[PDB]
Structure 1
Amino acid sequence: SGFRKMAFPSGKVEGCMVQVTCGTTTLNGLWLDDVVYCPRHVICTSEDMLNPNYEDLLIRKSNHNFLVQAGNVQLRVIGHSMQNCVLKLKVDTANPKTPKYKFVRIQPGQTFSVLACYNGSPSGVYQCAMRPNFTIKGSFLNGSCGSVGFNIDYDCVSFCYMHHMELPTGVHAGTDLEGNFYGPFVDRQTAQAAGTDTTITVNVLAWLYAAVINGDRWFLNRFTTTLNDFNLVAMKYNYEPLTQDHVDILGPLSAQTGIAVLDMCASLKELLQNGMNGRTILGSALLEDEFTPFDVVRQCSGVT
């Protein structure tokens, strides 16, 4: 019993982290097979970052300008190319620790683990979600760029995020491993405001199921609702609209607890309208939305 914000074990990703230096800019890269992936802004001076022309900046860079260090051992760069907002540095050595891996582009509301790194060295691991506004709420200092987000399915690491940007509001923006930003963000030091950070309704419901499974039941009520009625309330509280697809995804947690999804929706509706009244659910005073239904099932079943 007990329910924690849990990250994937980071070892498979720790084995992939390197340092990339271009001129005086040092950040992290991801070494898979004989390719090192890193943010293209590694080539920028702070001057450059105001209005960078990456294709023009890259013309001044050669293979020998990209210094790639794995632990205290230098890697030989034999090629480089820009794909969207990432550089791919071809090296002469396959990473001997390359795990089975995929590159996936996640949807808003999907969760992933971040291995925060500085100078190619892991500092910590934590759980994030792709927010509905395509930001993430991370912990990233200068030098953390090139840190990656991932999911693990048994032995296969699915890389979904690479860190690039902090907005002036202290939230984070990045790319998939093909170098495409999540949302409308650009790797330029310009006016970029995030949209509404809506609550991921299906995740909250998943976490309310987690709470019931773990003995926290005070918020269960005598009510039900409909998707349309619930959605009127979601709208008012800046919750994502709940779809039948979300109901279907919650089916297994419905089955295990015997609480109909729409009954749990009616519990969530009363919590929105009435607040917590100074009570907690799984040690939280607010409604947690960075556990997916898949996360709740995984953690409640002990998947490895």
Structure 2
Amino acid sequence: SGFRKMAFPSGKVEGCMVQVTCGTTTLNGLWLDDVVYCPRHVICTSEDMLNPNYEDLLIRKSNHNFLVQAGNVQLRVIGHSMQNCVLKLKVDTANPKTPKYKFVRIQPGQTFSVLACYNGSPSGVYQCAMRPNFTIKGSFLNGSCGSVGFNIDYDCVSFCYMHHMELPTGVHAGTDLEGNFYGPFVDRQTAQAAGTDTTITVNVLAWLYAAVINGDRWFLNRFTTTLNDFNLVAMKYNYEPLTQDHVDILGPLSAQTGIAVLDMCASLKELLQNGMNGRTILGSALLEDEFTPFDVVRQCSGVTFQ
């Protein structure tokens, strides 16, 4: 038993991280097959980032202006092309460590693991959620750009995020692996603001089920409620509204614990109005929303990967 903020094992992804340099800028890229993916702002200087014209900037770069290093090995760049906000560098050698992989664009509220890298070298791994305003609350220093977020489904790695920038508010923004930003952000150093960061209600509920599985039941209450009455309270507290799809997602957890989704909703409601009162749930004094219903099931049943 017990419950921990768990990340996916990162071995499959460590073998895909390379160091990409263009001019005097160095960041991380992702080496899959004979293509290296990296943030297109690798071709910018600190001054260019204020108002970059990436098309004009890229015209003055040739295949030999890009240095790709796989550890202490040199990859030869034989072709380049810009797709949205990523560069695609075609190299001469296919990565012998390419795993079964796919690209996916995730929805807000989904979770993934981030492998934070510097100079193509892994530094650490952590789990996070995509916030409803399409930012992530990460841990990134200079040179981490091109670090990637991923999920694992048995033997297949689903890449879903590449880090591109830190906003002036200290939160983080990036793209899918096709180069389309999550949210309305652009790869320019300018005052950009994110919308309201709401709590992911369906994830809070999954976590409350995990607490019950692990023996934290004090918050369970004798009331019940309806979807409408609950959503009207939730919205007052900047919680995402719950839909019937979210009720379907929580079905298996409802069956294991014997607690109806709507009964759990009525417990959460009382918590939103009356606070924790100094108590904790699974060692937390705040309501956690970085576990999805799938994550809870995965951890409480012991899924593995190869």
Q: In which range does the TM-score fall when normalised by the shorter chain?
A: over 0.9
CA distance in 2 between counterparts of 1:61 and 1:283 reads 53
CA distance in 2 between counterparts of 1:100 and 1:223 reads 48
What's the CA shift string for 1:124-146, capped at 9, x where partnerless? Answer: 00001110000000000000000
CA shift at 1:70, angstroms?
0.5
SS of the aligned residue for 1:183 comes to coil
SS of the aligned residue for 1:30 comes to strand
SS of the aligned residue for 1:205 comes to helix
| Alignment-derived partner of residue 65 in structure 1 | 65
What's the CA shift string for 1:218-270, capped at 9, x where partnerless? Answer: 10000111110110111000000000000000000000101000000011101
CA distance in 1 between counterparts of 2:34 and 2:224 reads 55
What's the CA shift string for 1:95-133, capped at 9, x where partnerless? Answer: 100000000000000000000000000000000111000
CA distance in 1 between counterparts of 2:300 and 2:254 reads 13
CA distance in 1 between counterparts of 2:281 and 2:140 reads 28
CA shift at 1:283, angstroms?
1.0
| Alignment-derived partner of residue 189 in structure 2 | 189
CA distance in 2 between counterparts of 1:10 and 1:222 reads 43
SS of the aligned residue for 1:55 comes to helix
CA distance in 2 between counterparts of 1:95 and 1:257 reads 46
TM-score, with normalisation over the residues of structure 1? 0.99
SS of the aligned residue for 2:250 comes to helix
CA distance in 1 between counterparts of 2:120 and 2:86 reads 16
| Alignment-derived partner of residue 142 in structure 1 | 142
CA distance in 2 between counterparts of 1:243 and 1:216 reads 26
CA distance in 2 between counterparts of 1:161 and 1:220 reads 37
CA distance in 2 between counterparts of 1:290 and 1:97 reads 30
CA shift at 1:274, angstroms?
0.8
Q: Which runs of 5+ in 1 are unaligned?
A: none
2:204 is the alignment partner of 1:204 = yes
RMSD value, Cα: 0.5
CA shift at 1:191, angstroms?
1.2
CA shift at 1:272, angstroms?
0.6
SS of the aligned residue for 1:117 comes to strand
SS of the aligned residue for 1:21 comes to strand
CA distance in 2 between counterparts of 1:132 and 1:303 reads 27
CA distance in 1 between counterparts of 2:17 and 2:274 reads 46
SS of the aligned residue for 1:272 comes to helix
2:94 is the alignment partner of 1:129 = no
What's the CA shift string for 1:265-291, capped at 9, x where partnerless? Answer: 011101111111111111111000010
CA distance in 2 between counterparts of 1:17 and 1:233 reads 45
What's the CA shift string for 1:6-64, capped at 9, x where partnerless? Answer: 00000000010000001111000000000000000000001100110101100011111
Identity across aligned pairs (percent)? 100
2:81 is the alignment partner of 1:112 = no
| Alignment-derived partner of residue 242 in structure 1 | 242
TM-score, with normalisation over the residues of structure 2? 0.99
SS of the aligned residue for 1:282 comes to coil
| Aligned length in residues | 304
| Alignment-derived partner of residue 17 in structure 1 | 17
CA distance in 2 between counterparts of 1:213 and 1:283 reads 14
CA distance in 1 between counterparts of 2:214 and 2:90 reads 48
CA distance in 1 between counterparts of 2:272 and 2:7 reads 28
What's the CA shift string for 1:66-90, capped at 9, x where partnerless? Answer: 1000111111111110000000000
CA distance in 2 between counterparts of 1:49 and 1:184 reads 17
CA distance in 1 between counterparts of 2:182 and 2:95 reads 27
